[PDB]
């Protein structure tokens, strides 16, 4: 009931703990299936809890690489994008005007709208209620408005909540003090439908078996349209390819710079994850390349990650003989997502996967912030590789 | 404290990356593309294959077109790895029985084209077993272009007892394009034996029982799959799927008077001293992407036993990253600093020339 594997140790789970997640229950359950049938594990990066009821409507598209601007996890915007980003998560107000500037270009280069805030009364229920995030709403007489209070971290600032009917549904519109001034709330919507953006899936990273390891692991730089066109041969291509091939806007939406840093293996991987979903048409939650190859990667804000693993992993000694299962020593919930809460764990599930033949991408970034650098080619070596570099040494007299 | 480079020289792919890794860090065709009216190598001539003539510079794991294959390992060093080669010591791969002049070639385009500081030349079945933990045993080879046992005794190869068989993955293609045909099915052309590679790789299998399977498939479709085409058309492949591996077992299948894989292994073990042939049959490891056939290790223990005498035990070792085992052989022995030694430096082959190697 321990794994031990050279240097590696670890105990089995006593008293497994409930951790609260933000993706939907039925997502999980659909990753878990693509983690079997593709047989890949899949990492994915925190969704804040209170974006779960937005996500699960699959009313809204969500935020991809030409809005970098960051959803807000507190307030009556939680699980939208602010315009004004010192209404956004911590990360946001961290670096205000870097944060403002992605949400105005966003906005300002067609990538983007801004579109007023409404919230329907389950929502208010959800966030005064289930989460207390707001403070309940108290009748302002002196505009007509409901006053309501929320906390980003030490401060208190409050929002006036208005009735109004628009679409013919009855909505609360989102006000706040905009310089000692009433002001509609402004949030980052859709290019096309104008509707305000939810935060997407971000792949934390894609782990794929040592015997399906070739030329689709490529890690490949955005290419222009024109670069992309010289390098490939119409004929050879899929008809998704040849329509990029045919048409620079649909090539600029789907493809090159909108993918980041990405190998062909991801792209594919993307497309399978967001069918399997059934989030296409604009409404895709996987946008971009997986973290492990993210320049920018702040390893702070990658837990807690679901990943989501081949089926064998769950069997009496799926991690090898005598190893036992993944769920004695990482915490998988009711969907099969295993639950990595910190760079610690994250590098003994990495270590877990590698040792049973899942490849590993590192980021040096990962490291950055970290007491000792874990995510490192050495430190990551297979225990298989390094045994039987052992074994050699000692029978070969060398 | 500099890190030596591990090339494996493939037919088809070429891995490439540093000793002490466990993984290479490039795996590219080994393919070289001229323009059809300067040269492109991997990756980028596959890509640009339309309008590209493809050249194979290694046929049947022996290198045959230098000029080609020096453009290999330049991209190899300056675009996959992006090293300066005078820098690193340099472990190339052989294919078994490579004749003595290729390997001298191989030595002199490494120091006078490249200025490796060192080099070694290993055969590729041997550091397969390396990988695996062992320096006794008998490997099955089964890569691209060619197939091979090599039986190994406390790390050294029985030169006497290999056995080359020139089946491999590639003709296995073919032989899938061609028995496609007989249910009205056509790929003919070049992209066309992709897609059939594919096919291959994804759905075919060895079956346990042949016959019982061709019965099987002939009754009933619980064997068929469905596949489907780059332009979405939708293809229904039924007993190809194990009728193509079968081609190892039975290789009359695409004309060829050969022995079967399991025949060749039991005879290469036959010409071995009776007081090693237990340790043989106990440690018979696998290979190569053509030996990475679901049902292959299970049909091999089942044919080696009915040819081996009852009191024999019979292990097949088929490890799951057994494509890149060649690879990561050629790490293990070139990341053991006390192997410093066999390794030829540039001194030494200034003054001997290229026989140094053997
Ligand atoms: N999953 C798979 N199932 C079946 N065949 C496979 C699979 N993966 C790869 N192959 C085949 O294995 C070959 C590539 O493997 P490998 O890299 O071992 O060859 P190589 O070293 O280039 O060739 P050689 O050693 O014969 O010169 C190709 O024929 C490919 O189609
Ligand atoms: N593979 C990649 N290549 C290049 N840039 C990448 C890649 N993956 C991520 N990025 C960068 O990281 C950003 C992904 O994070 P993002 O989704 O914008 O915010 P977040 O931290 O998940 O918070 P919210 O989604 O706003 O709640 C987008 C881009 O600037
Ligand atoms: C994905 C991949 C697989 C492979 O094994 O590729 C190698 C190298 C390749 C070279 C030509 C091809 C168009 C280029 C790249 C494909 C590389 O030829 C192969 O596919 C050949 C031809 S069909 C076959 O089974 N082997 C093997
Ligand atoms: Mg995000
Ligand atoms: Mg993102
Ligand atoms: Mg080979």
Request: glycine share 6%; proline share 5%; hydrophobic share 35%.
């Amino acid at each position: 009931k321990t794994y031990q594997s050279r240097d590696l140790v670890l105990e089995p789970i006593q008293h497994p703990k409930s951790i609260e997640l933000g993706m939907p229950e039925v997502d999980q359950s659909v990753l878990a299936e693509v983690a079997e049938r593709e047989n890949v594990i899949i990492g994915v990066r925190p969704v804040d809890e209170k974006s779960k009821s937005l996500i699960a409507s699959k009313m809204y598209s969500s935020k991809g690489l030409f809005v970098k601007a960051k959803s807000s996890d507190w307030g009556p915007m939680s699980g939208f994008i602010p315009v004004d980003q010192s209404f956004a998560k911590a990360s946001a107000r961290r670096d205000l005007e870097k944060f403002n500037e992605y949400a105005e270009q966003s906005i300002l280069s067609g990538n983007a709208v801004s579109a007023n805030l409404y919230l329907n009364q389950v929502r208010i229920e959800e966030l005064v209620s289930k989460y207390e995030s707001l403070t309940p709403l108290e009748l302002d007489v002196d505009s007509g408005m409901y006053k309501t209070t929320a906390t980003n971290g030490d401060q208190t600032i409050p929002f006036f909540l208005n009735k109004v009917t628009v679409d013919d549904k009855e909505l609360w519109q989102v006000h706040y003090l905009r310089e000692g001034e009433l002001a509609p709330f402004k949030v980052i919507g859709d290019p096309v439908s104008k509707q305000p953006m939810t935060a997407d899936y971000d792949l934390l990273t894609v782990m794929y078996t040592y015997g399906d390891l070739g030329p689709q692991d490529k890690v490949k730089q955005p290419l222009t349209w024109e670069q992309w066109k010289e390098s490939v041969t119409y004929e050879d291509l899929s008809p998704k390819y040849k329509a990029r091939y045919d048409n620079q806007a649909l090539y600029e939406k789907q493809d090159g710079a909108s993918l980041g840093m990405v190998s062909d293996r991801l792209k594919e991987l993307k497309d399978v994850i967001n069918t399997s979903l059934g989030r296409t048409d604009g409404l895709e939650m996987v946008h971009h390349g997986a973290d492990d190859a993210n320049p920018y990667a702040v390893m702070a804000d990658n837990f807690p990650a679901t990943f989501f693993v081949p089926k064998h992993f769950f069997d009496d000694d799926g991690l090898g003989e005598g190893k036992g299962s993944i769920q004695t020593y990482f915490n998988v919930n009711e969907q099969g997502a295993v639950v990595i809460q910190n760079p610690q764990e994250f590098s003994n599930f990495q270590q877990v996967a590698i040792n049973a033949s899942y490849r590993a991408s590192l980021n040096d970034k990962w490291n950055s912030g970290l007491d000792s650098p874990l995510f490192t080619t050495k430190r990551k070596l297979s225990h298989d590789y390094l045994d039987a570099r052992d074994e050699v040494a000692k029978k070969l007299g060398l | 404290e500099t890190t030596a480079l591990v090339c494996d020289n493939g037919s088809g792919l070429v891995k490439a990356g540093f000793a002490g890794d466990d993984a290479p860090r490039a795996v590219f065709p080994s393919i070289v593309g001229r323009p059809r009216h300067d040269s492109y190598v991997g990756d980028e001539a596959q890509s640009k294959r339309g309008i590209l003539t493809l050249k194979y510079p290694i046929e049947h794991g022996i290198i045959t077109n230098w000029d080609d294959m020096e453009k290999i390992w330049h991209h190899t060093f300056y675009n996959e790895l992006r090293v300066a080669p005078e820098e690193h010591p340099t472990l190339l791969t052989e294919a078994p029985l490579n004749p003595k002049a290729n390997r001298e070639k191989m030595t002199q385009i490494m120091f006078e084209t490249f200025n490796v500081p060192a080099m070694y030349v290993a055969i590729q079945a041997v550091l397969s077993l390396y990988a695996s933990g062992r320096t006794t045993g008998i490997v099955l080879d089964s890569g691209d272009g060619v197939t091979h046992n090599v039986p190994i005794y406390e790390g050294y190869a029985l030169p006497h007892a290999i056995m080359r068989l020139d089946l491999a993955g590639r003709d296995l293609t073919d032989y899938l394009m061609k028995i496609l045909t007989e249910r009205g099915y056509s790929f003919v052309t070049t992209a066309e034996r992709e897609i059939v590679r594919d096919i291959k790789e994804k759905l075919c299998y060895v079956a346990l029982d042949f016959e019982n399977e061709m019965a099987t498939a002939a009754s009933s479709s619980s064997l068929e799959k469905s596949y489907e085409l780059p332009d979405g058309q939708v293809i229904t492949i039924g007993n190809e799927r194990f009728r193509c591996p079968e081609t190892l077992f039975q290789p009359s299948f695409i004309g060829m008077e050969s022995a079967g894989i399991h025949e060749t292994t039991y005879n290469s073990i036959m010409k071995c001293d009776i007081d090693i042939r237990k340790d043989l049959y106990a440690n018979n490891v696998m290979s190569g992407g053509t030996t990475m056939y679901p049902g292959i290790a299970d049909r091999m223990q089942k044919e080696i036993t009915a040819l081996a005498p009852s009191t024999m035990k019979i292990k097949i070792i088929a490890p799951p990253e057994r494509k890149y085992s060649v690879w990561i052989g050629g790490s293990i022995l070139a990341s053991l600093s006390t192997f410093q030694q066999m390794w030829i430096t540039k001194q030494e082959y200034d003054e001997a020339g290229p026989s140094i190697v053997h």
